[PDB]
């Protein structure tokens, strides 16, 4: 609708952009006594841009539409230019530092925070970080904007009134700032720069003597000694220590996971030879049954005779140790075709080889919980030898007589621990005489009609079942896991302690002491300049004085700048 | 047969051999214009063979014979006979370092290349960046080779010559060639070498000033100042800072690695208690369709008055929705036991407990194509009431009356999300009274003759289908998968930042500014040698002049060398 | 036992303790000599109880009784005390640093050793390392105990007796040491300190000059070189340079890790259309068997006249080969429903589609040997065309006459890979023309009774099988594994050897030429003291002559080891 009005109307769309543009040079040329205001208003716009950016970023949260997110570029659109306008006002030549270094303190950030962003989100808190730096850059832009009214030298100067409230400020700052801002002054004299650069070092250090010089005088006391003040350099030094040797202790556990692994599902199969499997069961809720400490307790008082079964059990919580309830009947009918029944029948009777049976079970964890290894299995066989009188019996149950049923010893291992990995071996520690503490398995087979040929399945049970006899109870032992072992190999943990160790000594050693630089600027401070100058004449900063003399060739605004060192030389 | 022809004759075999040494030993004693020439040959073999096996390493390319990098093997070894052994010509008394010179610049090489390949190959362009480097020596070794002829002074000289052009060429090596160059230096007088180290660089310093003043002069202008000069390197210099700023910005391209996931494999059963499972189905191609633009118009339509809905809907690409068209009549014959299917009957008329009925799914995901989870699944359960209606007429159905049926309402959840983790959630936002928004599914038994009982399996409806009562369609929206998540662990990706920014400030950092250092140099070169040696007494300098003096013991060659500083003194 | 007697008896629980005290009292100011001895006594008993410790730590092995963790931790209360009272009433009353340096040089440990046991162990070896660096500084305390008496500067002095060998000494400890030492002197008098670290550097290499000056005048010629000393210097170079080259080359050093996989399970089916699976298998031990070299030599000769072929064979060796001797009567019975069963044979008889023929594969690994991806599996179907010769002859065989089979052409693809992914292709080396290499399948229905319908299942063979027709081997080649990848994203690695070369390059680059601040040192040195002082009076150094001077309001005491700096200078 608004768009529409805009559109509707020629003239207001026109002839009203050239006013404006009229009272831009005519205002900023007949606004006498202003324009300075204007430039101040302008660094005042910009800020308050700055906080709306800065305070819209922080101020949305969560996710924007992607459109909106697009909106916000169109509307830093608006910011770059309008400053635009002004860019050249101040400006370039009158003060080109405006839209210069400042113009250069936004695009950089423009593009980190597009990018920052991403799909992910939590782009503006590493975002909003970037808006601050921007915002303080402005704070010293708007008193900047009148650069020649400004006087850039001057501004240095009320520092050093500051002192050591001033002198704070200027290390805060730090040299990255400062490389980044040499380069511009270095920009305008490049050339001097390299030979400027050096001098703005040995400024700084000039100007931080001046700093102890001043409160240092009223604060300075002769054989006098403060336990107070000596305590808390000291006690932070201790905590400075502490923190440097904490944080390798603080890391050395910063890794670290626990929590309990009960298979979902526990599956079990008995087969004999290549045969179609006799008895096929799968276990889940609510026949895994965990532990409740009296389980815990009675499994603690079965085992309590013998110390290695117990040091076992107690590396278990009961939360850690289920029971599988399996159905002792199988839970699918058996497929075998008839010619292969005939054949197994036979082969027990007649067979002059062994015959395997096989007891397998395979227990299957939830990854999402944690660990790496879904399912964790083994098997336990036994050799059933011709003619031998389980053999025999295990054949005579295929006649289908009901009542009948074959005893197979030290089938079932009652006791098995499912790791981490994909081994899951009975415990040794409970069983310690292995297969025959393992329990026999009495083994039916069921018939249904059916009209002769009817279906079939088998049933076994524990030989010694007493009050569940259609339950095979399995006691499961399951470690802990965790998602994250962290350190991995163990070279590459022990090269980080070192690159800690070792990068950390490095930079420790780097610092160093500079005990020749120290040694010419130290006598300075303390020295009179005459007496420094006569010092200052063998150190190149004297002949840096006698390139003060180049000054004359350049220009006296420039010169300006130079001069307020000799005004610092005179100081120094 | 080469190798036979050789071995047939013993004259061809020896006395030529021996012959050659005797012309070896005489070429030597040529001896003038020729040995000379004869080390520039050598230097050009060495060259020539080097580009050979570089021009062979880059060429062959792919893999070779693994017989083929033996004879290549061979092949070096024969190099390496050349060398050392023509070594006794500059050699090791003569062109003592130039003789073993690139001896030690070969080994090195050797041992990486066989390494480098591996059984991984790509070994050779890391391998030939290798042979360049021992190409470059070699050119300045040719013209070294008459090194009593070469004087290792002269060399320097010319570059001297070469000024700017020559000073570029210097800063191109780098410290790193110097360091190790250096040593050799060092290696023939080692413990003024400690000495001789510091003067090297202090030289290098003062062929630097040279080189200022000698172009500078004619490009020197007063008061003069050229736009373009600077622009070079501040955009330069901007340029270096977007790419500090832009690389961590880049970084970012990281984040990214999505892909469709379908299940493969969609498996659904429906249990009863714990007894077998009345129905088992497991779709797989063609039987999963991707939704087309029309299904997923069709679905936003249906959700569209609901603003929750359409955001998850919105989150899916066509591509990421599948439908499983699941068939109804179950794909296993039932396989319950008369008597457990008489204990079944029996507890859904009389039991007094509730009896569960259980509703799964499971999706298989092809992990080939990304993703860490194969399987993800979940289910639905349901209690049914004793004496409930549903109850009493599923037990009903036993007695195989082929039109009856039961209906279980609020069975089947239409909408399943499969996503990268294990648990496979009905989606709340399509179906928000959860349960009360499953579909009501119809069962029937179909007992089939047979002869009693009859084979039999069941089957499922949704209890409202219309056109197509053989499929219960599943609607399964997948999140896309990538192969690399990247960061991990927040804070292990914060550290490499800190450490990026941290380490960066480390390094630059560590540059800082020589002022102390850069006085006594700026000073001599604007600074007269009398008047340097004024200001050269009072340093270390001075004193290394006087050093100098002990050059009168030294051997008067080996003095030149130090002699050649004097000239640079006279210059300076 | 023992605790319980203390506890019986009131008077040797007390007075006794008070007695003691009062011979503490007594002890510390009486006989002329004693407390010193005293001192060095308690030094002693320090040493020993950190051996203790120390020797504790390495002696007891493996894991300890968390509880008897528990009381050495009380053991090292003990420790911690009884300097509690020698701690101030030792007392170093005067050498107050003693409880100081040594006081902290013990608390930073404690807190690691504890940290760095952890659950996993292996701790005290890391742990070790920190009991002998508290060791040695004891063994210096020890002398230190009597500090007014021991005289810091006169400790100094006696290495410069050592000279050379004390020299060396000085050396070994190393900056590190020495920044952490440098700070108890600076804490002292810290505002000096940082005036006074630079003294302490420059004190540390004028002890060094006279080190050289020392052993060097007797060891000193004039005129003379001995090639032994030269080489070891240089031999040693180039071994580090090789270690540089070789040991930072140890790089690769991670690039290893497989051996043999052979599908644990080896399953397969045979499927029409949607209909339940006509045959499944699943072959495991020892119907999965390994190639000997003889089946190896066989299928070499099978294949010899093709290049290919041959290559592709020359990738495996035998045990990365098995025969799946795939037993060919199904595993299960058919378990479709009549109609199902109907629906079938009519649509293989009627249907105007065609009916796709699946036959399926899907390998087993155990990834407990290694390898990511433990199922690795495809697929070949056939299009059976309406009205088909195939089609119907499979039709007719459910009608049930035992004798009818029908024969399916390229369904058996013998040779297939298993690689490390998940997609297992037939070896299209070995069977150049795909599924025309495939071999043919006969299948047939066995179904007998019951005495119309009987049990049924599918039996398929290789069409052209001889000696073993019941087994349908299919050849698997399976790629090797290893543990870890290594390097993973190119990227990454590329980097790592850049900072690894570039880091390498910024700590080379780092140490460059002290040029300026040799110069200084050198000519002093060389330069007699007075020469010196005018030489001294430019640099800094003088100037702290003149600090010297402010010596005069500092201690006496402290003024000595000032004083020291002086005779040092003389000696300058």
Same mark, same amino acid.
């Given at each position: ?14 002839? *009203? ?38 305070? *819209? ?37 009158? *003060? ?204 603690? $008082? ?13 590396? !278990? ?218 010092? $200052? ?23 300006? !700048? ?11």
């Amino acid at each position: 609708f608004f768009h529409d009005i805009l559109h509707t109307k020629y003239r207001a769309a026109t002839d *009203v952009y050239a006013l404006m543009f009229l009272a831009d040079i005519v205002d900023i040329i007949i606004i006498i006594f202003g324009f300075w205001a204007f430039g101040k208003h302008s660094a005042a716009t910009d800020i308050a841009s700055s906080l709306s950016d800065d305070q *819209v970023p922080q101020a949305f949260l969560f996710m924007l539409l992607v459109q909106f997110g697009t909106m916000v570029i169109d509307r830093a659109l608006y910011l770059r230019k309008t400053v635009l306008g002004k860019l050249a006002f101040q400006v370039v030549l009158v *003060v080109a530092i405006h839209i210069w270094m400042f113009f250069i303190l936004p695009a950089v950030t423009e593009r980190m925070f597009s990018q920052n962003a991403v799909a992910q989100l939590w782009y503006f808190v590493k975002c909003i970080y970037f808006a601050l730096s921007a915002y303080q850059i402005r704070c010293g832009y708007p008193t900047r904007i009148l650069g020649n009214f400004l006087t850039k030298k001057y501004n240095h100067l009320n520092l050093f009134l500051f002192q050591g409230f001033r002198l704070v400020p200027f290390l805060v700052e730090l040299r990255a700032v400062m490389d980044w801002v040499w380069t511009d002054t270095t920009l305008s004299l490049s050339n001097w720069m390299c030979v400027e650069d050096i001098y703005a070092n040995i400024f700084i250090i000039k100007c931080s003597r001046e700093t102890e010089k001043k409160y240092p005088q009223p604060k300075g006391q002769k054989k006098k000694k403060i336990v107070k003040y000596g305590m808390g350099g000291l006690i932070i030094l201790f905590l400075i220590a502490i923190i440097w040797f904490p944080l390798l202790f603080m890391s050395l556990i910063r890794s670290v996971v626990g929590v309990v692994n009960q298979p979902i599902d526990v599956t079990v199969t008995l087969k004999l030879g290549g045969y179609e499997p006799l008895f096929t069961m799968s276990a889940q809720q609510p026949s895994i049954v965990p532990f409740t400490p009296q389980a815990y307790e009675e499994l603690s $008082q079965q085992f309590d005779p013998y110390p290695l079964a117990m040091q076992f059990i107690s590396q !278990y919580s009961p939360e850690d140790i289920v029971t599988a309830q399996i159905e002792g009947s199988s839970g699918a009918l058996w497929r075998i075709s008839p010619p292969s029944r005939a054949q197994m029948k036979q082969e027990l009777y007649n067979g002059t080889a062994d015959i395997t049976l096989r007891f397998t079970w395979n227990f299957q964890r939830d990854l999402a919980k944690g660990g790496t290894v879904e399912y964790t299995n083994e098997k336990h066989t036994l050799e059933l030898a011709p003619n031998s009188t389980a053999r025999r019996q295990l054949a005579q149950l295929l006649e289908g007589r009901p009542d009948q049923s074959v005893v197979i010893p030290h089938l079932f291992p009652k006791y098995i621990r499912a790791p981490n990995g994909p081994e899951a071996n009975p415990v040794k520690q409970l069983q310690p005489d292995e297969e025959e503490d393992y329990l026999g398995v009495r083994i039916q087979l069921r018939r249904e009609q059916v009209g002769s040929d009817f279906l079939e399945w088998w049933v076994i049970e524990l030989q010694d079942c007493k009050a569940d006899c259609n339950l095979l109870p399995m006691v499961i032992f399951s470690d802990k896991v965790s998602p994250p072992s962290l350190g991995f190999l163990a070279g590459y943990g022990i090269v980080g302690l070192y690159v800690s160790i070792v990068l950390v000594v490095g930079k420790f050693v780097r610092g160093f002491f500079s005990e020749i630089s120290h040694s010419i600027m130290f006598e300075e401070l303390p020295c009179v300049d005459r007496i420094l100058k006569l010092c $200052q004449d063998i150190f190149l900063v004297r002949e840096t004085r006698e390139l003060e003399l180049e000054e004359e060739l350049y220009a006296k605004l420039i010169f300006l !700048y130079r001069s307020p060192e000799t005004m610092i030389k005179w100081t120094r």
